[PDB]
Amino acid sequence: GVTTFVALYDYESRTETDLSFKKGERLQIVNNTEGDWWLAHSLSTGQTGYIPSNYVAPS
Amino acid sequence: GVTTFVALYDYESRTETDLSFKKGERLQIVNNTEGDWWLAHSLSTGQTGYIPSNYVAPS
Amino acid sequence: GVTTFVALYDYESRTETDLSFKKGERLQIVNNTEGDWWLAHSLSTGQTGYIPSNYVAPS
Amino acid sequence: GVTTFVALYDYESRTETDLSFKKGERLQIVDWWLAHSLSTGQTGYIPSNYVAPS
Ligand code: NI
Ligand code: NI
């Protein structure tokens, strides 16, 4: 199936480009080569934005 | 590092491998930016494709 | 939903790490930061491997 | 370009926080390295001393 990560914690947006999400939300990672901020697409909300990589774990 | 640009104009692309986008859409720029066309991920839609560098500026 | 690419042409695996796919196949791109070869996970077959970057377009 | 390593040993991540893998599994590398498994398509960190160039 689609490979995803799962949110370990809620995250509230603080910037124009980050992605808010709730604990347990399934996220498809689009780009994870730029250090601690990964570009993610939420499979719940359809939104796309940067996430703190330490808030997620492989599904 | 995470590099985000913003579209200055609407663009309706001419091939499926180039993104169409709207003015104000934010785009993560990936890879080598030495040409006129840059690989990008849309923060509006999550799609990936090439964009014309003259249509974007740092966000 | 899941953000995907579609194969533009058939491709037959020739190495231990590339991925076979057929024209029209829906693929997840896991990495596309390294240039001419991207890492894909097929949503049609479940297989994973490198693909030529110019063989796919956003769905 | 794409950098592929191969696992020299099995590794079972106690919690599913790092990548679990088997000996012989190939991994794209993008003490701990972020990797994509070419067997499962999963992504996670792996211990660099468990891998060698494929
Ligand atoms: Ni799968
Ligand atoms: Ni979506």
Author numbering:
A (entry chain A), B (entry chain C), C (entry chain B): 85 to 143
D (entry chain D): 85 to 114, 120 to 143
What does the original paper state about this entry?
The SH3 domain is a small protein fold comprised of approximately 60 amino acids. SH3 domains are also identified in all eukaryotes as well as in some prokaryotes and viruses. These domains typically mediate protein-protein interactions and affect enzyme regulation, substrate binding, protein localization, and motility, regulating pathways that impact numerous cellular processes, including proliferation, migration, endocytosis, and actin cytoskeleton rearrangement. The founding SH3 domain was identified in c-Src and has been shown to play a major role in autoinhibition of its kinase activity. As our structure confirms, the c-Src SH3 domain structure consists of two antiparallel β-sheets formed by strands β1 - β2 - β5 and strands β3 - β4.
A unique crystal structure of the Src SH3 domain in the trigonal space group H32 is determined to 1.45 Å resolution. Crystals belong to space group H32 with unit cell dimensions a = b = 63.77 Å, c = 271.71 Å, α = β = 90°, γ = 120°, and four molecules per asymmetric unit. Chains A, B, and C are fully modeled from residues 85-143, while chain D lacks strong electron density for residues 115-119 (in the n-Src loop), which remain unmodelled. The two nickel sites are located at the interface of Src SH3 chains A and B in a 2:2 stoichiometry. The nickel atoms bridge the A and B chains by coordination of the nitrogen and carboxyl oxygen atoms of the N-terminal residue Gly-85 of one chain and the imidazole epsilon nitrogen atom of His-125 on β3 in the neighboring chain. Octahedral metal coordination is completed by three water molecules. We further examined the 2:2 stoichiometry interaction between the Ni2+ ions and chains A and B of the SH3 domain. These chains are related by non-crystallographic twofold rotational symmetry, and the interface buries a surface area of approximately 440 Å2 per chain. In addition to the intrachain Ni2+ coordination, the interface features hydrogen bonding between Gln-112 and Thr-87, as well as van der Waals interactions including Val-86 and Leu-127 near the nickel binding site. We thus conclude that the standard PxxP peptide binding to the SH3 domain at the xP and specificity sites is incompatible with the formation of the H32 crystal lattice since these sites in the SH3 domain are involved in crystal lattice contacts.
